[PDB]
């Protein structure tokens, strides 16, 4: 718990398209074998791009390469697209039976919009603090609302606020939530206080409504929150 | 709590491509209006395709509109595609000042594989069952494993089970873990005890490795688990 260890890969990589990239890893144990497995979104699963240091999947585009020396692996994109954006995990084994990640490499490829942060784990009785920062539009003449989805479940309205301040919330979280707006930040943020299992889920800035779900033209992409 | 107030939509509708889908939702106050959201998957964020019973964002093409009547809407997709495929929300107010959602309609338009289940809400000190169903290939002639990754973090080896059913565990979960095969209904199955936070995370089975990270060439859609 107080002690790790990981394979060592770097943070980040930056390509313009067109451009051949590498990256490297090291560690494992001393005859152990690489692969490689690309994540575009926290929210999808990984799939294998090399195994065995070298081999590719089926599926895989050859553009696709990897090798091994000693202690150490490469991945190799030829041609990167925009679509080949994603972290890519390095994996093998220790001199040991386990089995070891490194931290991943984020490979980066060099209208009104809503995004939504603040959430993550949560501890019961605790409070959280969303913000959704707006742009693209005069965020000031809009009405605007938090929804929530617990896991497995439907939408469910939280609370909003119209353009001369009125708040309104749902009985859910009724003495504990503020929702709040700053126009000159273009910002609305959501307060939720005493944090019970049933806050847990994804929340959802949109925009258009206060308590008028029916006037919602645009959502956020969520922020995740776990009690 | 004990009490809920919905509005009311039907759980499902299948059509075949090309036809002609409507589906109609009811409640809300009096003089209330109805939009409707479209959520390709759990994971994904709703989009608006009606707001204010009939107008269309842009970006949402023709073939979607809406109507009201009384206390009643109707959404109406005309050529449905299997793209088209989401669970649909209604939503609206009430008479007071609160948003309304209906449940959602299932919309259905009518090879190597491994699908996880048994996620879901868990209390701690709980226990939970999570198991992958194989297909597609000679089972018991591959070694599996599970990873999982919490919020916000890197991909963790959780356990793995051999051909021969040798089994290997994390440290995180040793003593509290359990891995299995059942190769007569290729399935795994992970019983991880004395749940703590952090186990809290999205659990993935992939095929190739017990311990070795580097043979895995297939990766399920993966499990959430919430603690
Ligand atoms: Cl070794
Ligand atoms: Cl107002
Ligand atoms: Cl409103
Ligand atoms: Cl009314
Ligand atoms: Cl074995
Ligand atoms: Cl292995």
């Known amino acids: 718990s107080f002690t790790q260890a990981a394979l060592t890969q770097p943070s980040s990589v930056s390509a313009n398209p067109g451009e051949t990239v590498k990256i490297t890893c090291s560690g494992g144990?001393?005859?152990?074998?690489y692969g490689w497995f690309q994540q575009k979104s926290p929210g999808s699963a990984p799939v294998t791009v090399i195994?065995?240091?070298?081999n590719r999947p089926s599926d895989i585009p050859s553009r696709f390469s990897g090798s091994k020396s000693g202690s150490t692996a490469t991945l190799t994109i030829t041609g990167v697209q925009a679509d080949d954006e994603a972290v890519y995990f390095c994996?093998?084994?220790?001199?040991?039976?386990?089995?070891?990640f490194g931290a991943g490499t984020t490979l980066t490829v060099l209208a009104v919009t809503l995004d939504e942060s603040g959430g993550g784990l949560q501890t019961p009785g605790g409070a959280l603090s969303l913000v959704c920062?707006?742009?693209?539009?005069?965020?000031?003449?809009?009405?605007?609302?938090?929804v929530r989805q617990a896991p497995s479940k439907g939408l469910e309205w939280?609370?909003?606020?119209?353009?001369?301040?009125?708040?309104?919330?749902?009985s859910a979280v009724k003495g504990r939530a503020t929702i709040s707006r700053d126009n000159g930040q273009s910002t609305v943020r959501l307060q939720l206080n005493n944090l019970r299992a049933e806050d847990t889920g994804t929340?959802?800035?949109?925009?258009?409504?206060?308590?008028?779900?029916?006037?919602?033209?645009?959502?956020?992409?969520g922020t995740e929150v776990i009690v | 709590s004990f009490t809920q107030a919905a509005l009311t939509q039907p759980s499902s509708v299948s059509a075949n491509p090309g036809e002609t889908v409507k589906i109609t939702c009811?409640?809300?106050?009096?003089?209330?209006?109805?939009?409707?959201f479209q959520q390709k998957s759990p994971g994904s964020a709703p989009v608006?395709?009606?707001?204010?019973?009939?107008?269309?964002?842009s970006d949402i093409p023709s073939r979607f509109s809406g109507s009201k009547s009384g206390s009643t809407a109707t959404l109406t997709i005309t050529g449905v595609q299997a793209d088209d495929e989401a669970v649909?929300?209604?939503?609206?107010?009430?008479?007071?000042?609160?948003?309304?959602?209906?449940?959602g309609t299932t919309l259905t338009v009518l090879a190597v594989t491994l699908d996880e289940s048994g996620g879901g809400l868990q209390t701690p000190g709980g226990a939970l069952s999570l198991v992958c169903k194989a297909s597609?290939?000679?089972?018991?002639?591959?070694?599996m494993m599970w990873v999982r990754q919490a919020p916000s973090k890197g991909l963790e080896w959780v356990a793995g089970?051999?051909?021969?059913?040798?089994?290997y565990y994390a440290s995180a979960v040793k003593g509290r873990a359990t891995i299995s095969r059942d190769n007569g209904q290729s399935t795994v199955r992970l019983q991880l005890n004395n749940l703590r936070a952090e186990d809290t995370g999205t659990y993935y089975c992939?095929?190739?490795?017990?311990?070795?990270?580097?043979?895995?060439?297939?990766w399920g859609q993966g499990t959430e688990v919430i603690v």
């Open positions: 992939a095929r190739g490795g017990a311990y070795s990270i580097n043979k895995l060439d297939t």
């Open positions: 597609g290939f000679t089972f018991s002639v591959y070694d």
């Open positions: 089970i051999g051909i021969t059913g040798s089994t």
């Open positions: 144990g001393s005859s152990s074998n």
């Open positions: 195994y065995n240091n070298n």
């Open positions: 994996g093998g084994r220790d001199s040991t039976y386990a089995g070891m």
